[PDB]
Scaffold this active site. Structure first.
Site, mmCIF file in Angstrom:
data_model
loop_
_atom_site.group_PDB
_atom_site.id
_atom_site.type_symbol
_atom_site.label_atom_id
_atom_site.label_comp_id
_atom_site.label_asym_id
_atom_site.label_seq_id
_atom_site.Cartn_x
_atom_site.Cartn_y
_atom_site.Cartn_z
ATOM 1 N N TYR A 20 -0.974 6.753 -2.303
ATOM 2 C CA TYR A 20 -2.333 7.127 -2.817
ATOM 3 C C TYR A 20 -2.788 5.780 -3.604
ATOM 4 C CZ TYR A 20 0.382 8.160 -7.086
ATOM 5 O OH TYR A 20 1.339 7.811 -8.407
ATOM 6 N N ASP A 52 13.997 8.466 -9.104
ATOM 7 C CA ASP A 52 13.583 7.834 -7.767
ATOM 8 C C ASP A 52 14.228 6.581 -7.529
ATOM 9 O OD1 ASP A 52 10.898 7.776 -5.421
ATOM 10 O OD2 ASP A 52 12.714 8.270 -5.173
ATOM 11 N N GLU A 96 0.745 -1.204 0.046
ATOM 12 C CA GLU A 96 0.168 0.037 0.037
ATOM 13 C C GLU A 96 1.055 1.243 0.044
ATOM 14 O OE1 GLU A 96 -2.500 0.309 3.521
ATOM 15 O OE2 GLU A 96 -4.212 1.691 2.461
ATOM 16 N N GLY A 97 0.828 2.024 -1.143
ATOM 17 C CA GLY A 97 1.553 3.328 -1.164
ATOM 18 C C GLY A 97 0.702 4.624 -0.529
ATOM 19 N N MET A 145 -3.042 1.151 -3.735
ATOM 20 C CA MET A 145 -2.610 -0.249 -3.092
ATOM 21 C C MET A 145 -2.265 -1.127 -4.441
ATOM 22 S SD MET A 145 -5.406 -2.865 -1.065
ATOM 23 C CE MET A 145 -5.445 -1.705 0.231
ATOM 24 N N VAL A 146 -1.610 -2.146 -4.315
ATOM 25 C CA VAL A 146 -1.156 -3.266 -5.230
ATOM 26 C C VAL A 146 -1.442 -4.717 -4.497
ATOM 27 C CG1 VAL A 146 0.641 -4.111 -6.818
ATOM 28 C CG2 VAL A 146 0.743 -1.726 -6.055
HETATM 29 C C1 LIG Z 1 5.910 1.005 2.240
HETATM 30 C C2 LIG Z 1 4.869 0.958 1.024
HETATM 31 O O1 LIG Z 1 5.387 0.060 -0.033
HETATM 32 C C3 LIG Z 1 5.584 0.340 -1.188
HETATM 33 O O2 LIG Z 1 4.556 1.326 -1.762
HETATM 34 C C4 LIG Z 1 6.206 -0.539 -1.937
HETATM 35 N N1 LIG Z 1 6.430 -1.855 -1.458
HETATM 36 C C5 LIG Z 1 5.553 -2.768 -1.465
HETATM 37 C C6 LIG Z 1 5.480 -3.548 -2.683
HETATM 38 C C7 LIG Z 1 6.175 -4.470 -3.060
HETATM 39 C C8 LIG Z 1 5.895 -5.218 -4.333
HETATM 40 C C9 LIG Z 1 4.933 -4.936 -4.994
HETATM 41 C C10 LIG Z 1 4.982 -5.612 -6.446
HETATM 42 C C11 LIG Z 1 4.949 -6.971 -6.636
HETATM 43 N N2 LIG Z 1 4.837 -7.330 -8.019
HETATM 44 N N3 LIG Z 1 4.507 -6.018 -8.822
HETATM 45 C C12 LIG Z 1 4.835 -5.035 -7.548
HETATM 46 C C13 LIG Z 1 4.495 -3.583 -8.088
HETATM 47 C C14 LIG Z 1 3.745 -3.375 -9.334
HETATM 48 N N4 LIG Z 1 3.646 -1.902 -9.467
HETATM 49 C C15 LIG Z 1 4.429 -1.417 -8.425
HETATM 50 C C16 LIG Z 1 4.522 -0.019 -8.215
HETATM 51 O O3 LIG Z 1 4.088 0.748 -8.937
HETATM 52 N N5 LIG Z 1 5.283 0.363 -6.915
HETATM 53 C C17 LIG Z 1 5.301 1.767 -6.698
HETATM 54 C C18 LIG Z 1 6.203 1.848 -5.742
HETATM 55 O O4 LIG Z 1 7.580 1.220 -6.051
HETATM 56 C C19 LIG Z 1 4.171 2.479 -6.120
HETATM 57 C C20 LIG Z 1 3.687 3.784 -6.624
HETATM 58 C C21 LIG Z 1 2.395 4.295 -6.267
HETATM 59 C C22 LIG Z 1 1.600 3.772 -5.371
HETATM 60 F F1 LIG Z 1 0.488 4.011 -4.980
HETATM 61 C C23 LIG Z 1 1.854 2.199 -5.109
HETATM 62 CL CL1 LIG Z 1 0.978 1.437 -3.882
HETATM 63 C C24 LIG Z 1 3.030 1.818 -5.531
HETATM 64 C C25 LIG Z 1 5.171 -2.381 -7.670
HETATM 65 C C26 LIG Z 1 4.198 -3.697 -4.824
HETATM 66 C C27 LIG Z 1 4.425 -3.200 -3.502
HETATM 67 CL CL2 LIG Z 1 3.142 -1.955 -3.211
#
Ligand SMILES: CCOC(=O)CNCc1ccc(-c2cn[nH]c2-c2c[nH]c(C(=O)N[C@H](CO)c3ccc(F)c(Cl)c3)c2)cc1Cl
Length: 347
Positions: free
Chosen positions: A26, A139, A23-24, A28-29
């Protein structure tokens, strides 16, 4: 409509069997089963329409990743949203599913030199393509480097990505910056807006140093402390490097500091490969103009086992934004997000 941890996640009927990942700020993944391609994927739910910043980060990423196609860069294979701008409250971006990331790995795993070498190669192979499109990631950090079970690496999060603009990079001393502090180049705190390819190389240098010891090399606790951490290891900048900083407040700040010697890389990293430290030195060069470039880094002897410029593709054309996204309201950015995602609708 299925939901994950008290939050609507309407991606059906194509994507089912949802499982939480992260969860980022803004969004969620979640991992989900694709009923068309019959493979699990990662879906990022975005809710950015209440803030201009979040709309800007969403649009930049969507536009860049739809035009990009590279093994070491995360893709956008589908976009799910409501059929009208009125009904669109969220955006679901379908991306590559990866088991772990470098942040997770470094917390608990010791990396062999072979692993460090392979990870660095893929980061720089991905960066070569990004930079060939005249794009800056801005970043790069271990959490934005995803990995699968076979150690295949993909660069993700292009929210702070911009088109390179070296002629408009200069700014004053202590100019506020958005990107992650620990991976900020020294010139950010002195006289740079981070509009050159050299800011990404610095971040890769910090990532390399982190892989060698499982700890961030420059863990600044606040804005100016970041620069003091960098000078603590690099030592006092040379007369030549100081002369390149014309801004008086930035130059006089550096001149006010007592003389600090360079901490040798082999003392900081006693178990690292000597070629790895020579490349580290070139990526963590104080002067951004003398800092190694991505193609030069790929040709360094440390990456000789992997270096093959014919198997390191570049983008077909340089990237260009149709309009400046820095001064557009959240309402107009919603329309632009609606337009860029139109090609993925059933009709
Ligand atoms: C402290 C909060 O943590 C984060 O935001 C990132 N770490 C957890 C994570 C770890 C792995 C994955 C993951 C696993 N498989 N594919 C993905 C993935 C797919 N898209 C993205 C992505 O765009 N991530 C960015 C940050 O790196 C992001 C950007 C904006 C956001 F709102 C969210 Cl939720 C995430 C990641 C997704 C996630 Cl969300």
């Amino acid at each position: 409509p299925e939901m994950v941890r008290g939050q609507v996640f309407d991606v059906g009927p194509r994507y089912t069997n949802l499982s939480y990942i992260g969860e980022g700020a803004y969004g969620m993944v979640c991992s989900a089963y694709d009923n068309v391609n019959k493979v699990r994927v990662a879906i990022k739910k975005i809710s950015p329409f209440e803030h201009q910043t979040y709309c800007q980060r969403t649009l930049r990423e969507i536009k860049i990743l739809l035009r990009f196609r590279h093994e070491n860069i995360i893709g956008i294979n589908d976009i799910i949203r409501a059929p009208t701008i009125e009904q669109m409250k969220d955006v679901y971006i379908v991306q590559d599913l990866m088991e772990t990331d470098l942040y997770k790995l470094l917390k608990t795993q010791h990396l062999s030199n072979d692993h460090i070498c392979y990870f660095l190669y893929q980061i720089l192979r991905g960066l070569k393509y990004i930079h060939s499109a005249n794009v800056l990631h801005r970043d790069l950090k271990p959490s934005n480097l995803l990995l699968n079970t076979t150690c295949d690496l993909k660069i993700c999060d292009f929210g702070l990505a911009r088109v390179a603009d070296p002629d408009h990079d200069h700014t004053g001393f202590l100019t506020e910056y958005v990107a992650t502090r620990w991976y900020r180049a020294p010139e950010i705190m002195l006289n740079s807006k981070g509009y050159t390819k050299s800011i990404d190389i610095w971040s890769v240098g910090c990532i390399l140093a982190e892989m060698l010891s499982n700890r961030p090399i420059f863990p600044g606790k606040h804005y100016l402390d970041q620069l003091n951490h960098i000078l603590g290891i690099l030592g006092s900048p040379s007369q030549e490097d100081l002369n390149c900083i014309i801004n008086l407040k930035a130059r006089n700040y550096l001149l006010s500091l007592p003389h600090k010697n360079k901490v040798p890389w082999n003392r900081l990293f006693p178990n690292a490969d000597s070629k790895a430290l020579d490349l580290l030195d070139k990526m963590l060069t104080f002067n951004p103009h003398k800092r190694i470039e991505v193609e030069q880094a790929l040709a360094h002897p440390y990456l000789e086992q992997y270096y093959d410029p014919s198997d390191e593709p570049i983008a077909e054309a340089p990237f260009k934004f149709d309009m400046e996204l820095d001064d557009l309201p959240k309402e107009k950015l919603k329309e632009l997000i609606f337009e860029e995602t139109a090609r993925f609708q059933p009709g």
